[PDB]
Design a protein around this ligand. Structure first.
Ligand code: HEM
Length: 293
């Protein structure tokens, strides 16, 4: 038997209210810019949007972005979530300013905000997630391991109802940010421009000379002479012939990657949620640049 989670618009709010939150997040991202050696909080916000959505299970409709359960200790302390506390504390002051927004809507909106402010595509976003109680927090272990191969990646993502194209598009977000030894047992960025959203991950995967090395934590990762790295799960995208075709596609067509990421990422953030027919349409927020702010 599967739960239903129906979206309920937080009371009386409309598009101008959520655009105000987006703007608060965007402004903080622009100011609090020294984090992680001047990478900024953009990438950890996108990670946080993904980890809070990616516990979803299509089979029983548990986990996912709806309940905003990352705020509970079982989930907050998932070893897979190590590092994400920095994104949570970045958002805490925003939530105090806008205490009316649910936790789900805030964690997911922070990811949308960060992608757009890092020059990525527009991501339509829908409000309505409702905080659910502590007993609904998912058990640890639902997020993926990095030391596996293409068959594991494909199987993992079937749980999230993601197909080959969606998975490859979604992994493009590893253009952003980096791995941190003390968080995950891997170290290094995937590329040079790690707080601008581009198709650089696919380019580097195809064009770099990758060498399998062991890092100071005794895990294997692929390293290049440029100073980039790839997780085994990243690198498996060029080992699997179906994945590789899509990697080449996104490497050679920026716009297509942007459109496919937008669709897949929205779906990720909305998995598990039922929207009434009279729910508002998806919002498309303007960036600070578009508002002239
Ligand atoms: C195979 C599945 C995935 C694996 C194994 C994986 C693994 C990792 C790991 C280990 C990190 C580094 C954390 C750290 O130690 O600092 C990371 C970072 C990141 N992941 Fe993935 N990830 C996966 C999928 C995704 C997806 C689908 C997204 C897109 C929403 C995503 C977005 C990110 C981002 C933005 C970071 C950078 C965070 C930061 O820079 O602090 N990842 N990932």
């Amino acid at each position: 038997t599967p739960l239903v989670h129906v979206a309920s618009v937080e009371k009386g709010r409309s598009y101008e209210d959520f655009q105000k939150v987006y703007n608060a997040i965007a402004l903080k991202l622009r100011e609090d810019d020294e984090y992680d050696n001047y990478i900024g909080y953009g990438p950890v916000l996108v990670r946080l949007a993904w980890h809070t959505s990616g516990t979803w299970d299509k089979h029983d409709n548990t986990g996912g972005s709806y309940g905003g359960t990352y705020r509970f200790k079982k989930e907050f302390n998932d070893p897979s979530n190590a590092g994400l506390q920095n994104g949570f504390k970045f958002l805490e002051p925003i939530h105090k300013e806008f205490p009316w927004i649910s936790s789900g809507d805030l964690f997911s909106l922070g990811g949308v905000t960060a992608v757009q402010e890092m020059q990525g595509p527009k991501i339509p976003w829908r409000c309505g997630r409702v905080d659910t109680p502590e007993d609904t927090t998912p058990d640890n272990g639902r997020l993926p391991d990095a030391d596996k191969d293409a068959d594991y990646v494909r199987t993992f993502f079937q749980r999230l109802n993601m197909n080959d194209r969606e998975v490859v598009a979604l992994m493009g977000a590893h253009a952003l940010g980096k791995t941190h030894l003390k968080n995950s047992g891997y170290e290094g960025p995937w590329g040079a421009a790690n707080n601008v959203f581009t198709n650089e991950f696919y380019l580097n995967l195809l064009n770099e000379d990758w060498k399998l090395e062991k890092n100071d934590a005794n895990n294997e990762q692929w390293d290049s002479k440029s100073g980039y790295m790839m997780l085994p799960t990243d690198y498996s995208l060029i080992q699997d012939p179906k994945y590789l075709s899509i990697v080449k596609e996104y490497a050679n067509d920026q716009d297509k990657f942007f459109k496919d990421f937008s669709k897949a990422f929205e779906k990720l953030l909305e998995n598990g949620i039922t929207f009434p027919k009279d729910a508002p349409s998806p919002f498309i927020f303007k960036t600070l640049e578009e508002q002239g702010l």
